[PDB]
Ligand binder design. Structure first.
Ligand SMILES: CC(=O)N[C@@H]1[C@@H](O)[C@H](O[C@@H]2O[C@H](CO)[C@@H](O)[C@H](O)[C@H]2NC(C)=O)[C@@H](CO)O[C@@H]1O
Length: 129
């Protein structure tokens, strides 16, 4: 599914991401735009053999198990295929676990390069939430 910007914002708001660990809703919408262009089916392989899955490009080395990654820690206790669903529940529940690490949302490389520090509140402007 390719989400629209305000459609995704509303889905994320109903799952408790607004102001989760200090981060306003626009941070998560910005992270999903630069990680996957709002595409639930996005995947990218990493050099080490893990793959990043779904709308938030969560990797299989630490977070989900895809079968193909030797020594996946699977900290979110989910198969990586669950992150490819049009339903984003599993992706946001896992995202909350990774944003609980010491560097918070800096675990999303696209967020730290293209979103961090900017007026991220713009990403939810005009959405009826
Ligand atoms: C939360 C999450 O999974 N974010 C992804 C990053 O982890 C990806 O970064 C890359 O991750 C692998 C697995 O740890 C590292 O081997 C790799 O070096 C690292 N790459 C970079 C440039 O940091 C990232 C890949 O674009 O995608 C999500 O942000």
């Amino acid at each position: 599914k390719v989400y629209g910007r305000c459609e995704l914002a509303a889905a994320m708001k109903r799952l408790g991401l607004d102001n989760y660990r200090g981060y306003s809703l626009g941070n998560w919408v910005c992270a999903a735009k630069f990680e996957s262009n709002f595409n639930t089916h996005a995947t990218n392989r990493n050099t080490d053999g893990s793959t990043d899955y779904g709308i938030l490009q969560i990797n299989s080395r630490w977070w989900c198990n895809d079968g193909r990654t030797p020594g996946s820690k699977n900290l979110c206790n989910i198969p990586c295929s669950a992150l490819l669903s049009s339903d984003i529940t599993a992706s946001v529940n896992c995202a909350k676990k990774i944003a609980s690490g010491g560097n918070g949302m800096n675990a999303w490389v696209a967020w730290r390069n293209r979103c961090k520090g900017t007026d991220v509140h713009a990403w939810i402007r005009g959405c009826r939430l």
